Design a protein around this nucleic acid. Sequence first.
RNA 1: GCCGCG
DNA 2: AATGTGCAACAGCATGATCGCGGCAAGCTGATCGTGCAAAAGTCGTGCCAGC
Lengths: 147, 241, 46, 98, 50, 49, 74
Amino acid sequence: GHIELASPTAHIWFLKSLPSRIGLLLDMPLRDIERVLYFESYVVIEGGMTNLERQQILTEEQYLDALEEFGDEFDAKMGAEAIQALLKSMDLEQECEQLREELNETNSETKRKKLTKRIKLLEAFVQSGNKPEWMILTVLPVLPPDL
Amino acid sequence: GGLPRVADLFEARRPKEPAILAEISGIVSFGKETKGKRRLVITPVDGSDPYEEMIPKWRQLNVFEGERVERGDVISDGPEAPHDILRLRGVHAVTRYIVNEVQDVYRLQGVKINDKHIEVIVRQMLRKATIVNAGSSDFLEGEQVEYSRVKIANRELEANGKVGATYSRDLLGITKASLATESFISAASFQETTRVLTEAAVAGKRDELRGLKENVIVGRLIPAGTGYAYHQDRMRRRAAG
Amino acid sequence: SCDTDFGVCAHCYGRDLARGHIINKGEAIGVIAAQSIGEPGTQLTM
Amino acid sequence: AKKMVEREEAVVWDILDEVIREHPVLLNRAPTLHRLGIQAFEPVLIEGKAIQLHPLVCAAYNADFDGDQMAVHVPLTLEAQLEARALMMSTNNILSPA
Amino acid sequence: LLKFLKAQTKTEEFDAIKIALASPDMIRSWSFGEVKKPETINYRTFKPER
Amino acid sequence: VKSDDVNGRTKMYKNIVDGNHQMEPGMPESFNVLLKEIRSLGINIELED
Amino acid sequence: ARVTVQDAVEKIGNRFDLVLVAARRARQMQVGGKDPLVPEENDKTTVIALREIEEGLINNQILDVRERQEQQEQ
RNA sequence: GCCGCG
DNA sequence: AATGTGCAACAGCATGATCGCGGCAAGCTGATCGTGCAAAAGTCGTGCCAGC
Ligand SMILES: [Mg+2]
Ligand SMILES: [Zn+2]
């Protein structure tokens, strides 16, 4: 059996563990994703015409200022649908190549370990055939009654 | 002392004050521009490629002169971590260290245990070498020595011998050596299962049921003892198709 | 230093202490070693 | 057969004595520290309620007779019987493998 | 369509168990239905709910 | 056979009463339960061939 | 009765293989279609097969040749 | 949850 | 001579801390309303023929 959630939700298994898989896949700290996943702050996507970045952690007041100034072109949302949208748009091979070039061009011990961890995770995802959009779960299974 | 030390030895924990070691030729260098940071920066040229070490000056320096200090020498007094022993003095040196220090705990009380049973445990702590050269699809990552040995054997056999990449062996405690094995069914039944399944689920790996706990869990014949003979028959059929 | 893959040579490992002869192929020596090291400890004065 | 065993006639006792003949059962003590903590013995039927243990093996079990209890398991297979007879018998493990 | 055994054939040869993330379509594939009502058992007839 | 194999129990009992002393092992129910518990998470685990 | 299985162990030396050989022989004698080659002292099939191995008249190779002979006969 | 047994 | 970068110390959080066995009570405690209507299903008071 199964449950249709009618609203995307995140998997605590991967979101909340010390080497957060989704957190370092997004290359952003755990606190920002935790705040956006519980509707404390928004996150924007695209908006190239406006000054907003690709991964802004703009809050409600910043959102009001943006919609008063920028108006349109601000695709900002808060729910797990936000992580949906920003995870589907991510390109695996291009990001892996860009990060590999960044790691090989600049030598620094502090960033080298994080870069290698990110490369390892990305390569594992592209090789296993999984889709990173599957971290969060749209449909939730249920156990058999006799168990 | 005591025997929160057979635990302390097997996990290979770094002690409070490790003793520093040196390299091939320890010429007199003292310290150049010893500022308020770690002073007495020793820079032995050793002909080429000098090694710059930093000491916080809170620990005395032993060898004032050169005396042609070789690798593994005691630059400063103190207990030695097993990791330093393995990196510099060799694999046989760390085995004699752990065996002698563990047996000291048992001998002092009056317990007889053969040295064979400690070298077996140490052998399971000396897996997973770190690769430092490339060309064989590996570059600066920790892989099992068994896989590193077979990769070298095939690469050396072929004409392109230079592809074979040397490694730097690594030492892991018992609690960290068991959780990192290639079978995810094992190491999920012993310590943190939330972390082990999460990294196995993402990587999409398989177990292949090669050990003892994997076969015990699924109710098959273990590959040891009277079940060893049966497991060999299955292996040859798999290779033959 | 047995250098064999996924196991240990019957010659690199000595004779099994339980019986006088050399060890036979297929004897699970890891569990035996772990039990031998861990059977004491209840008599180590910590 | 079930009713006859329930009523436990004398012939049931004779047949029980017959099936016990060369069927080793294996005993273990609670803190099975090493592998000598579980050993296979040939049973001898006794009139009582307490298991009788050979004194010599006690040092292997770390067992004293001051309220200790032991568990009995029956290896109900041909292969298991040969394994108990040729690997777990008290006459097989004389030296400690440590 | 008789003389069928399903418990015996339920045991199939296997080796090398594998693990990976579960896609939503695969989750639908496992399921034999969708639950919408939370009720566990009713007492009017002592039967599982629809 | 002794504990978890649901059909192994009955087969072993019938073999003993017959006088066969044959194992005919199988698949422990505990591992099927564990597979269902893992699958009830967001994780897919299966038996490959 | 075999109190100790040392003789069978030196006859075919593994301490692990004679369990399999004796299990096969005991199965042959217990399921049916075979009779002991050693006098029977009302023992079980287990120690009977062990005695047969100890006497040196049963091992893996000759068991295989007897199986082949039976197959060729039919 | 408590108590005891080796 | 003012400035940016990499390294190290301190705080917070995750994890695990023996194996069997026996006996006794108390919790184990546990509910989403009504809705008011067709639509269906069932039921009851009544009359029917067939057997003695
Ligand atoms: Mg006692
Ligand atoms: Zn060897």
